[PDB]
Amino acid sequence: AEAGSRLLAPLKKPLIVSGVLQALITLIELAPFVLLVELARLLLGGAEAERLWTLGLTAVSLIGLGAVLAAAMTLWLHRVDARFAHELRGRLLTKLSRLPLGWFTRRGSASTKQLVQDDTLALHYLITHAIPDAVAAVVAPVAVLVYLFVADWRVALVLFIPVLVYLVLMSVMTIQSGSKIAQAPRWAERMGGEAGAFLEGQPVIRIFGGAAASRFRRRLDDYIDFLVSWQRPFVGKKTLMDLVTRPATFLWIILVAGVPLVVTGRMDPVNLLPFLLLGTTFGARLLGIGYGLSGIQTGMLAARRIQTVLDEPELVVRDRTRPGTVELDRVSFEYRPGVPVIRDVTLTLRPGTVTALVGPSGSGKSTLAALVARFHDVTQGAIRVDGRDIRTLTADELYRRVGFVLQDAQLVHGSVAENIALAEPDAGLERIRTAARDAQIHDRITRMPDGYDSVLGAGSALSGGERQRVTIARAILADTPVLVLDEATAFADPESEYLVQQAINRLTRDRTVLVIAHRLHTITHADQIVVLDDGRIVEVGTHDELLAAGGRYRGLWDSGRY
Amino acid sequence: IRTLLRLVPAEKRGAVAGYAVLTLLSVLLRAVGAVLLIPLLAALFSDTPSDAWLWLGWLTAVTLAGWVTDTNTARLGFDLGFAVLSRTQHDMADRLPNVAMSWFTPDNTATARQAIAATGPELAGLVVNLLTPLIGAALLPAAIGVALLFVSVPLGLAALAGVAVLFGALALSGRLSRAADKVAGETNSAFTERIIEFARTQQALRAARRVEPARSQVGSALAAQHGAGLRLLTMQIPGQVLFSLAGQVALIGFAGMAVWLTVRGQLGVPEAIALIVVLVRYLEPFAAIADLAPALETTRATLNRIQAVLDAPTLPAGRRRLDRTGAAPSIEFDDVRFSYGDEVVLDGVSFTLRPGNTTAIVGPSGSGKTTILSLIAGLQQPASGRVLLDGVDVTTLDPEARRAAVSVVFQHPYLFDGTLRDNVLVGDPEADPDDVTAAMRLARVDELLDRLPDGDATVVGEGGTALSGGERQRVSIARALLKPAPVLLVDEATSALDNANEAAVVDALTADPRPRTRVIVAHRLASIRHADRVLFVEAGRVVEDGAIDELLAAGGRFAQFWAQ
Ligand SMILES: Nc1ncnc2c1ncn2[C@@H]1O[C@H](COP(=O)(O)OP(=O)(O)OP(=O)(O)O)[C@@H](O)[C@H]1O
Ligand SMILES: Nc1ncnc2c1ncn2[C@@H]1O[C@H](COP(=O)(O)OP(=O)(O)OP(=O)(O)O)[C@@H](O)[C@H]1O
Ligand SMILES: [Mg+2]
Ligand SMILES: [Mg+2]
Ligand SMILES: [Zn+2]
């Protein structure tokens, strides 16, 4: 696979050496049994004792040398694999930092977890074991069989019977499970998505249907049906391979072919000693790669998935190359091709002005905020911050110029100090208390058991309106020249909403602010009110001008009183 | 292993007895097959090789019987492995919706996610891949030692002497690596929860510039994951060294006794040569145990997570049912107390809702409004006090009857990844298309179907992520209205909807033709239109309540609330 060779290119020389070392090791692991054959041949021959001690002690030590070399070789090769995955996992996280945000929405958090963690873990056998097992499974059966075929071709041919049966069993097993191996990672992604939604959507499941009617229960039953149909023939062929390749199976068929040749005057019992001692050894090497073809197939698929994401388009920072000003020029955008959401929007945001973005639900006002953040590139037109295109700005410059609150008060697993200081983690507690105080959340944080160290993990510590005021505190602490407030203060009560708004006006007096609100009574003070209907600017003006116009804004304002 | 037998179904305990008998029989047959070479080669090397036929016949019978035993052991191991898989996974799927909502901490959610994530082929093939070779590899040296007693007593004792060394290495190898393996799993489990957080919180992280691995929390969890992973590879070195010493010590003990007997005439040369083959067969399980022992410790963590969910505290329930399935019940609290941990939310709430009426709940943010609705729907339960539906305590009510009594609109609309229609149908999957259309038309979701290109087949993201904030809110409202439950709970349905859509939705919450007792947790004075009663809740009790005109006339906290 091209996508697999490109990804595993850094491990070219480590993997070549692991193949060369295992050829030497497995030869060393077979040397004791060649010497034990000579020890056995000389015990029958009545040789001198000191010669037997030489063969006996050398053979026992060579068993120790092979065990030491084998253990050391897998240790180094396991650490090469461990260091590659850290390098690879960090590469993926670096890549995902830059991808357009439509990648995350169309995929989900369960597929990202499978990508960064499970798919990199799926490469373990391919990197650490596939080449060691392949070289062992080649050189050891080949070295043993060539040694034994010279010893006796009659018994040596009979050793091919379990070998050929093993090759047929793994080949048939490989073609059968090839389709299921490819289908397997999709099912894990789906079950991770269902399991994640099952855990996250627990209030919905508890009230609507419970366990019985849940989408997770059905997919759980379907997944096990896939596993049983996948694993029953796979495990069934696995055991026949183990039975075929076992030492007891080789030893029995050596004796079935051997004893009649010895009872009759066709073979000496001395010449059976190579078969009894070495004939039973190479079966375990054969089973190593036979059990391992699935690891290679899954690893090669995972490497293909990983390199596909690392080849993704990236929202590049191009080298094309008034303060606080943001200008939208002929901006258009499509979440999906052929589905307009923004249509030729032209707008300018100037310092010391409050711009209110209003309109019907689903008109694209949150999309415009995301476009200024450059979560997605505009399909047409341009968005320029302080005279420079954001496609030319780097991420640090872009997000130091403009700050965001996003209508979906996402909180990370950490303390409220870590959440409020998300923008500037090096900020001090004195600043955090100041930012939290302005966001009207400091009093709540004081009442917590651990105070500002209290953790904000899953299902903890805050109501919906309290989460939003934490994210406002984050934006205050960032202290960027431009600010965007996507539906902020939506869950805030009127008494608390006034205090937060008054603080925002105080802090952003001389700064560019883009407020987005459905509650039109809260944006009467805006310098300009921009009405976005069906992804296009239908009217622009002050509150009185838009009311007198008798257009969409007057309709929304009149309908606000019910 | 003690933990796995706990998870075995009771209906399969007949198969475990058969599996155990065949598993012991597998070891006995393999060991007899190995020691049957000593008389066979002794007869083969003798002056009368024709005597070798008797021992080859017994070897053929023992080996053929071994194939039948180990094939059946594989069928039962597969059946037992998947029976435990489907039993535990279905039990966890059944149990988790009944587990107390306080149990879903970030640590336990990781445990439940990993426990559910164990559904793959690795856990299913547990009995085939781990227990069968572990039991065989552990008992095979002991069975060869017992089998060798019929050839020579001290030789069998010497082979049993090395068995004790094998178990000594087996116990110590797990003991040395148990401290490091626990950290490796814990740091690897934290890394899972940060990738999910990383993907789920990209906008907030990207704006905050906490997205690059040098500055991100997932990058820090990756650095700790790597350090704990490399530490595990190092602290596992003593175990592999200790198994190698055990194998070498057993080799010296076995070979030392064989040579000692041979020079003293108690053991012929062919018997001694035959024991070299039995020595190799005796020593192969020493290496097999070494390869399987690291996998044994990861299984113990896997089964512990599964048992952690199965031991999770399910919520109290009964077997009562409402007097009528669809009639509007009266909702009342009788001095309800509630607290999240030590932080109190409610401190003696007592109200009564008339059946079939619509009442409103308003108050400051963080007051307890969402907690009140959760207690009515049974998501939470009081620390003390009681909630009664139609005069029947919900804590003593059937989970089916309790679940069917309430439909809710949540403050934060969560939609499952799927089509827009599938999320509406969750309210009542058995409803006919006429009923589903009525629910969508009431919730103004019909307008979405015109604007959206795929209509009701629009693919909703994780949550309602692939929909606007106001679009997913109306899909949630259609879901709640479709359900025929006689109690409707509404929580900030106005938050994400524009003025035109808000007014239609608010009118639809009461224009719904079913008779329901409605509770409206609202944000605006206009949002509580058509409300028969209003409850003002502040600091965990209903400080004030009454009609809208009554409270405005009194100029109480209700009037001060809208004055900002
Ligand atoms: N999971 C939780 N763990 C701990 N405390 C919580 C949790 N959820 C809410 N709280 C706290 O419980 C109290 C009431 O919260 P609740 O969600 O019931 O309020 P609310 O009136 O619905 O608020 P809002 O208008 O902000 O949604 C507040 O102190 C809130 O911080
Ligand atoms: N990730 C997405 N993928 C596809 N379509 C999307 C996505 N996010 C939003 N949309 C659609 O784009 C249009 C506008 O979305 P957006 O979130 O910008 O709306 P909005 O005006 O902010 O909404 P509201 O006022 O309800 O919060 C709607 O059709 C919405 O369904
Ligand atoms: Mg929006
Ligand atoms: Mg709430
Ligand atoms: Zn490995």
Short mmCIF file of N, CA, C and O in Angstrom, two decimals, chain A residues 60 75 82 94 96-97 99 101 104 109 117 197 202-203 206-208 210 217 221 227-228 232 239 246-247 249 252 255 263 269 280 336 361 399 413 422-423 444 449 464 490-492 494 518-519 556 559-560, chain B residues 45 49 59-60 67 70 74 78 82 90 94 96-97 99 119 188 192 194 197 203 206 209-211 213 226 237 248 281 343 403 408 410-412 414 453-454 462 474 483 494-495 497-500 523-524 564:
data_model
loop_
_atom_site.label_atom_id
_atom_site.label_comp_id
_atom_site.label_asym_id
_atom_site.label_seq_id
_atom_site.Cartn_x
_atom_site.Cartn_y
_atom_site.Cartn_z
N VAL A 60 22.81 -26.14 26.30
CA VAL A 60 22.02 -25.48 27.33
C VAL A 60 22.31 -23.99 27.36
O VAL A 60 21.40 -23.17 27.53
N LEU A 75 12.41 -6.22 23.15
CA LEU A 75 12.39 -5.03 23.99
C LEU A 75 12.71 -3.79 23.18
O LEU A 75 11.98 -2.79 23.21
N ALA A 82 6.90 2.05 20.33
CA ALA A 82 6.31 2.98 21.29
C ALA A 82 6.69 4.42 20.96
O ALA A 82 5.88 5.33 21.13
N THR A 94 -1.32 17.47 15.74
CA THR A 94 -0.90 18.69 15.05
C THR A 94 -1.70 18.90 13.78
O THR A 94 -2.08 20.03 13.46
N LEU A 96 -4.80 17.72 13.09
CA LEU A 96 -6.19 18.03 13.42
C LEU A 96 -6.37 19.45 13.92
O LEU A 96 -7.47 20.00 13.81
N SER A 97 -5.31 20.06 14.46
CA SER A 97 -5.39 21.46 14.88
C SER A 97 -5.67 22.38 13.71
O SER A 97 -6.26 23.45 13.89
N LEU A 99 -7.04 21.37 10.45
CA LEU A 99 -8.04 20.98 9.47
C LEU A 99 -9.27 21.89 9.56
O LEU A 99 -9.56 22.45 10.62
N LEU A 101 -13.07 22.94 10.11
CA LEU A 101 -13.90 22.40 11.18
C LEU A 101 -15.05 21.54 10.66
O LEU A 101 -15.66 20.81 11.45
N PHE A 104 -14.49 17.87 11.54
CA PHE A 104 -14.90 17.35 12.84
C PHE A 104 -16.40 17.13 12.91
O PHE A 104 -16.87 16.19 13.57
N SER A 109 -16.68 12.79 17.38
CA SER A 109 -15.59 12.61 18.32
C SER A 109 -15.20 11.15 18.52
O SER A 109 -14.10 10.88 19.01
N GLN A 117 -5.98 7.20 18.61
CA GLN A 117 -5.62 6.17 19.57
C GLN A 117 -5.68 4.76 18.99
O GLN A 117 -4.68 4.05 18.97
N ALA A 197 -22.82 8.70 22.34
CA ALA A 197 -24.14 9.31 22.40
C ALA A 197 -25.01 8.66 23.46
O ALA A 197 -25.83 9.34 24.08
N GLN A 202 -27.83 10.51 27.94
CA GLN A 202 -28.53 9.74 28.96
C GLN A 202 -29.84 10.37 29.41
O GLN A 202 -30.81 9.62 29.60
N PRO A 203 -29.95 11.69 29.64
CA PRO A 203 -31.27 12.25 29.97
C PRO A 203 -32.32 12.01 28.91
O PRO A 203 -33.50 11.83 29.25
N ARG A 206 -33.27 8.20 29.17
CA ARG A 206 -33.99 7.86 30.39
C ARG A 206 -35.48 8.19 30.28
O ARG A 206 -36.30 7.56 30.96
N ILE A 207 -35.85 9.17 29.45
CA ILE A 207 -37.22 9.65 29.38
C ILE A 207 -37.89 9.15 28.10
O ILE A 207 -39.10 8.90 28.10
N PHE A 208 -37.13 9.00 27.03
CA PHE A 208 -37.65 8.56 25.73
C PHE A 208 -37.15 7.14 25.45
O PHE A 208 -36.11 6.95 24.83
N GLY A 210 -35.99 4.55 27.21
CA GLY A 210 -35.15 3.76 28.08
C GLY A 210 -34.19 2.87 27.30
O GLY A 210 -33.87 3.12 26.13
N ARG A 217 -28.94 -0.11 22.02
CA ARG A 217 -29.26 -1.51 22.25
C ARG A 217 -29.38 -2.27 20.93
O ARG A 217 -28.88 -3.40 20.81
N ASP A 221 -26.77 -5.23 19.63
CA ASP A 221 -27.13 -6.57 19.16
C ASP A 221 -26.59 -6.82 17.76
O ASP A 221 -26.11 -7.92 17.46
N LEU A 227 -19.79 -9.73 15.05
CA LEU A 227 -18.64 -10.36 15.69
C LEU A 227 -18.73 -11.88 15.65
O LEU A 227 -17.74 -12.56 15.38
N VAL A 228 -19.92 -12.43 15.93
CA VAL A 228 -20.08 -13.88 15.95
C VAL A 228 -19.87 -14.46 14.55
O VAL A 228 -19.19 -15.47 14.39
N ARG A 232 -16.65 -16.77 14.64
CA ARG A 232 -16.88 -18.22 14.64
C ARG A 232 -16.06 -18.92 13.57
O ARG A 232 -15.36 -19.90 13.90
N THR A 239 -8.13 -22.79 15.53
CA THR A 239 -7.86 -23.97 16.35
C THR A 239 -7.35 -25.12 15.50
O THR A 239 -6.46 -25.86 15.93
N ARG A 246 0.77 -28.29 16.19
CA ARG A 246 1.23 -28.56 17.55
C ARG A 246 2.42 -29.52 17.52
O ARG A 246 2.56 -30.31 16.58
N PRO A 247 3.31 -29.47 18.52
CA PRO A 247 4.38 -30.47 18.58
C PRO A 247 3.87 -31.89 18.70
O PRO A 247 4.48 -32.82 18.15
N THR A 249 1.22 -33.10 17.35
CA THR A 249 0.76 -33.54 16.03
C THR A 249 1.93 -33.91 15.14
O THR A 249 1.89 -34.92 14.42
N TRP A 252 3.48 -37.21 16.53
CA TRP A 252 2.69 -38.40 16.22
C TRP A 252 2.88 -38.84 14.77
O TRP A 252 3.01 -40.03 14.49
N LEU A 255 6.19 -40.44 14.11
CA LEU A 255 6.23 -41.82 14.58
C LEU A 255 5.35 -42.74 13.74
O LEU A 255 5.66 -43.93 13.61
N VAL A 263 10.49 -50.70 12.59
CA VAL A 263 10.11 -52.09 12.85
C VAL A 263 10.52 -52.97 11.68
O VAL A 263 11.08 -54.06 11.87
N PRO A 269 16.69 -46.63 14.20
CA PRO A 269 16.07 -45.69 15.15
C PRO A 269 16.96 -44.51 15.49
O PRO A 269 16.46 -43.51 16.03
N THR A 280 9.71 -31.16 15.60
CA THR A 280 8.59 -30.62 16.36
C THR A 280 8.77 -29.15 16.73
O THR A 280 7.89 -28.59 17.39
N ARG A 336 -21.84 22.30 2.71
CA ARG A 336 -21.82 21.22 1.73
C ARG A 336 -21.94 21.82 0.34
O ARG A 336 -22.60 22.86 0.18
N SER A 361 -33.95 32.11 12.52
CA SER A 361 -33.15 30.95 12.90
C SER A 361 -32.66 30.21 11.66
O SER A 361 -33.41 30.00 10.70
N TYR A 399 -6.10 34.67 16.34
CA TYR A 399 -6.83 34.55 17.59
C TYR A 399 -6.31 35.47 18.68
O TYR A 399 -6.95 35.57 19.74
N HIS A 413 -12.41 19.62 30.51
CA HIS A 413 -12.23 18.92 31.78
C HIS A 413 -11.05 19.53 32.51
O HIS A 413 -9.89 19.24 32.22
N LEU A 422 -8.28 29.70 29.87
CA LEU A 422 -8.00 28.86 28.72
C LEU A 422 -7.19 29.62 27.67
O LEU A 422 -6.24 29.08 27.10
N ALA A 423 -7.55 30.88 27.42
CA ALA A 423 -6.85 31.65 26.39
C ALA A 423 -5.40 31.90 26.78
O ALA A 423 -4.51 31.83 25.93
N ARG A 444 -20.48 32.77 42.27
CA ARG A 444 -20.77 31.35 42.19
C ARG A 444 -19.52 30.52 42.45
O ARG A 444 -19.56 29.54 43.20
N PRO A 449 -17.04 24.07 46.62
CA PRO A 449 -16.29 23.47 47.73
C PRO A 449 -14.80 23.74 47.63
O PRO A 449 -14.19 24.23 48.58
N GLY A 464 -26.80 25.71 32.88
CA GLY A 464 -26.59 26.21 31.53
C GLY A 464 -26.20 27.68 31.49
O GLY A 464 -25.31 28.07 30.73
N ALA A 490 -27.74 34.24 26.46
CA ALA A 490 -29.02 33.63 26.08
C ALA A 490 -29.74 33.05 27.28
O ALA A 490 -30.95 33.23 27.43
N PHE A 491 -29.02 32.35 28.15
CA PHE A 491 -29.59 31.74 29.35
C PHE A 491 -29.49 32.64 30.57
O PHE A 491 -29.97 32.25 31.64
N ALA A 492 -28.90 33.83 30.45
CA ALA A 492 -28.75 34.72 31.59
C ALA A 492 -30.08 35.40 31.91
O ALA A 492 -30.80 35.83 31.01
N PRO A 494 -32.55 38.43 33.30
CA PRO A 494 -32.42 39.86 32.98
C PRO A 494 -31.58 40.65 33.98
O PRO A 494 -30.86 41.57 33.58
N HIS A 518 -30.92 36.89 19.20
CA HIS A 518 -32.31 36.74 18.79
C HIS A 518 -33.24 37.66 19.57
O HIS A 518 -34.31 38.03 19.07
N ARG A 519 -32.84 38.04 20.78
CA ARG A 519 -33.63 38.95 21.62
C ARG A 519 -33.29 40.37 21.18
O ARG A 519 -32.30 40.95 21.63
N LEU A 556 -39.85 40.96 12.85
CA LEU A 556 -39.30 40.26 14.02
C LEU A 556 -39.58 41.03 15.30
O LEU A 556 -39.92 40.43 16.33
N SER A 559 -43.28 40.70 16.27
CA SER A 559 -43.58 39.35 16.73
C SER A 559 -42.94 39.01 18.07
O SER A 559 -43.26 37.97 18.64
N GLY A 560 -42.06 39.87 18.59
CA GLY A 560 -41.43 39.59 19.87
C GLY A 560 -42.35 39.76 21.06
O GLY A 560 -42.08 39.19 22.12
N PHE B 45 14.15 -48.64 20.31
CA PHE B 45 15.58 -48.87 20.33
C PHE B 45 15.96 -50.25 20.86
O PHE B 45 17.13 -50.63 20.76
N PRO B 49 11.97 -54.20 18.11
CA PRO B 49 11.18 -52.98 17.82
C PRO B 49 9.70 -53.24 17.60
O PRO B 49 8.92 -52.28 17.62
N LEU B 59 -0.49 -43.92 21.71
CA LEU B 59 -0.21 -42.55 21.31
C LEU B 59 -1.25 -42.05 20.31
O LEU B 59 -1.68 -40.89 20.38
N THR B 60 -1.63 -42.90 19.36
CA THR B 60 -2.65 -42.51 18.39
C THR B 60 -4.00 -42.28 19.06
O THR B 60 -4.72 -41.34 18.71
N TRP B 67 -7.39 -34.19 19.95
CA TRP B 67 -7.99 -33.33 18.93
C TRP B 67 -9.48 -33.15 19.18
O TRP B 67 -10.01 -32.05 19.03
N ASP B 70 -9.81 -30.86 22.35
CA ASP B 70 -9.44 -29.47 22.14
C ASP B 70 -10.28 -28.79 21.07
O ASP B 70 -10.31 -27.55 21.04
N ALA B 74 -12.60 -25.67 22.20
CA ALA B 74 -12.64 -24.44 21.42
C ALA B 74 -14.07 -24.00 21.13
O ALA B 74 -14.35 -22.80 21.09
N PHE B 78 -15.46 -20.50 22.71
CA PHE B 78 -16.11 -19.50 21.88
C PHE B 78 -17.50 -19.18 22.41
O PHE B 78 -17.88 -18.01 22.52
N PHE B 82 -18.42 -15.49 24.02
CA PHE B 82 -19.46 -14.62 23.48
C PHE B 82 -20.69 -14.56 24.39
O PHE B 82 -21.39 -13.54 24.41
N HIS B 90 -25.24 -6.55 27.47
CA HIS B 90 -26.67 -6.30 27.61
C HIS B 90 -27.02 -5.89 29.03
O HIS B 90 -27.92 -5.07 29.24
N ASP B 94 -28.66 -2.37 29.92
CA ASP B 94 -29.88 -2.28 30.72
C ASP B 94 -29.64 -1.48 31.99
O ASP B 94 -30.51 -0.69 32.40
N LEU B 96 -27.26 0.86 32.87
CA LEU B 96 -26.81 2.25 32.83
C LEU B 96 -27.95 3.26 32.81
O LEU B 96 -27.84 4.28 33.51
N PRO B 97 -29.04 3.08 32.06
CA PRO B 97 -30.17 4.02 32.17
C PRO B 97 -30.81 4.06 33.54
O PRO B 97 -31.54 5.02 33.83
N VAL B 99 -28.75 3.62 36.35
CA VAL B 99 -27.70 4.06 37.25
C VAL B 99 -27.96 5.50 37.67
O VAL B 99 -28.45 6.32 36.89
N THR B 119 -16.43 -4.26 23.71
CA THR B 119 -17.29 -5.17 22.97
C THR B 119 -16.58 -5.85 21.80
O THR B 119 -17.11 -6.83 21.27
N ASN B 188 -3.51 5.93 29.80
CA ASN B 188 -4.08 5.66 28.48
C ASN B 188 -5.58 5.93 28.46
O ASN B 188 -6.13 6.28 27.41
N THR B 192 -7.73 8.90 26.18
CA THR B 192 -8.97 8.70 25.45
C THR B 192 -9.95 9.84 25.70
O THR B 192 -10.59 10.34 24.77
N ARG B 194 -9.38 12.87 26.48
CA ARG B 194 -8.92 14.14 25.93
C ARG B 194 -9.05 14.20 24.42
O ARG B 194 -9.28 15.29 23.88
N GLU B 197 -12.63 15.02 24.10
CA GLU B 197 -12.75 16.43 24.41
C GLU B 197 -12.12 17.29 23.32
O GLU B 197 -12.63 18.37 22.99
N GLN B 203 -13.79 24.35 18.58
CA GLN B 203 -13.97 25.79 18.43
C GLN B 203 -13.39 26.55 19.62
O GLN B 203 -12.62 27.50 19.46
N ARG B 206 -9.58 26.11 19.72
CA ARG B 206 -8.89 26.82 18.64
C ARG B 206 -8.85 28.32 18.90
O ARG B 206 -7.82 28.96 18.69
N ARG B 209 -6.37 29.01 21.48
CA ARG B 209 -5.02 28.62 21.10
C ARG B 209 -4.47 27.51 22.00
O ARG B 209 -3.26 27.36 22.15
N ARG B 210 -5.36 26.71 22.59
CA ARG B 210 -5.00 25.52 23.36
C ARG B 210 -5.14 24.25 22.53
O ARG B 210 -5.47 23.19 23.06
N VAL B 211 -4.88 24.35 21.22
CA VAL B 211 -5.12 23.27 20.29
C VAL B 211 -3.83 22.60 19.82
O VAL B 211 -3.86 21.42 19.46
N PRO B 213 -0.33 20.65 20.11
CA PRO B 213 0.06 19.67 21.15
C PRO B 213 1.04 20.20 22.18
O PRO B 213 1.07 19.68 23.30
N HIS B 226 2.77 8.37 26.89
CA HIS B 226 4.01 7.78 26.38
C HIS B 226 4.96 7.43 27.52
O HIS B 226 5.58 6.36 27.51
N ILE B 237 10.50 -5.93 32.18
CA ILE B 237 11.75 -6.67 31.96
C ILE B 237 12.02 -7.66 33.08
O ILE B 237 12.41 -8.80 32.79
N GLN B 248 15.22 -21.93 32.90
CA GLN B 248 16.57 -22.47 32.99
C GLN B 248 16.75 -23.31 34.25
O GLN B 248 17.38 -24.37 34.21
N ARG B 281 9.14 -30.56 25.52
CA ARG B 281 7.70 -30.43 25.74
C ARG B 281 7.40 -29.90 27.13
O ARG B 281 6.40 -29.19 27.32
N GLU B 343 -23.47 20.54 47.96
CA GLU B 343 -24.06 21.81 47.56
C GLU B 343 -25.57 21.63 47.43
O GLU B 343 -26.04 20.94 46.52
N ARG B 403 -41.43 6.13 33.31
CA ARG B 403 -40.86 6.67 32.08
C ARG B 403 -41.95 7.14 31.13
O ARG B 403 -41.78 8.15 30.44
N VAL B 408 -40.20 15.58 28.09
CA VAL B 408 -39.47 16.78 28.47
C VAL B 408 -38.79 17.40 27.26
O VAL B 408 -38.41 16.70 26.31
N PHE B 410 -35.41 19.55 26.95
CA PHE B 410 -34.26 19.88 27.77
C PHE B 410 -33.73 21.28 27.44
O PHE B 410 -34.01 21.85 26.38
N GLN B 411 -32.95 21.82 28.38
CA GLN B 411 -32.36 23.14 28.18
C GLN B 411 -31.32 23.13 27.07
O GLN B 411 -31.19 24.11 26.33
N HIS B 412 -30.57 22.03 26.95
CA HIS B 412 -29.49 21.89 25.97
C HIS B 412 -29.88 20.75 25.04
O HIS B 412 -29.60 19.58 25.34
N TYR B 414 -30.00 17.79 22.96
CA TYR B 414 -29.09 16.77 22.45
C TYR B 414 -29.84 15.88 21.47
O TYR B 414 -30.88 15.30 21.82
N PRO B 453 -32.07 20.82 2.46
CA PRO B 453 -32.19 20.18 1.15
C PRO B 453 -32.68 18.75 1.24
O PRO B 453 -33.45 18.30 0.38
N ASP B 454 -32.29 18.04 2.29
CA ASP B 454 -32.68 16.66 2.50
C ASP B 454 -33.99 16.52 3.27
O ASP B 454 -34.42 15.39 3.52
N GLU B 462 -23.09 14.84 15.66
CA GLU B 462 -22.99 14.41 17.05
C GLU B 462 -23.65 15.47 17.93
O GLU B 462 -23.24 16.64 17.90
N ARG B 474 -35.94 23.03 17.92
CA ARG B 474 -37.27 22.69 17.44
C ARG B 474 -37.41 21.20 17.15
O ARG B 474 -38.49 20.63 17.33
N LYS B 483 -44.52 12.41 21.78
CA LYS B 483 -44.79 11.41 22.80
C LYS B 483 -46.17 11.66 23.43
O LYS B 483 -46.52 12.82 23.70
N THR B 494 -37.22 28.67 24.46
CA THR B 494 -37.12 29.95 23.75
C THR B 494 -35.68 30.38 23.47
O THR B 494 -35.49 31.36 22.74
N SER B 495 -34.68 29.69 24.02
CA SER B 495 -33.33 30.25 24.09
C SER B 495 -32.73 30.50 22.71
O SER B 495 -32.13 31.55 22.47
N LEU B 497 -34.32 30.37 19.56
CA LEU B 497 -35.29 30.62 18.50
C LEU B 497 -35.52 32.12 18.33
O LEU B 497 -35.59 32.86 19.31
N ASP B 498 -35.64 32.55 17.08
CA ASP B 498 -35.91 33.95 16.80
C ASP B 498 -37.32 34.30 17.24
O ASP B 498 -38.11 33.46 17.68
N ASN B 499 -37.65 35.59 17.12
CA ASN B 499 -38.91 36.10 17.65
C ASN B 499 -40.10 35.47 16.93
O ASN B 499 -41.12 35.17 17.56
N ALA B 500 -39.99 35.26 15.62
CA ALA B 500 -41.09 34.67 14.87
C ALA B 500 -41.26 33.19 15.22
O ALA B 500 -42.39 32.73 15.45
N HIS B 523 -37.86 31.89 30.16
CA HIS B 523 -36.86 32.95 30.24
C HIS B 523 -37.46 34.34 30.18
O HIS B 523 -36.99 35.24 30.89
N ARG B 524 -38.49 34.55 29.36
CA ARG B 524 -39.10 35.85 29.15
C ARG B 524 -40.51 35.88 29.72
O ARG B 524 -41.12 34.85 30.00
N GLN B 564 -34.87 44.06 35.66
CA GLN B 564 -33.42 44.05 35.51
C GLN B 564 -32.74 44.84 36.63
O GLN B 564 -31.51 44.94 36.68
#
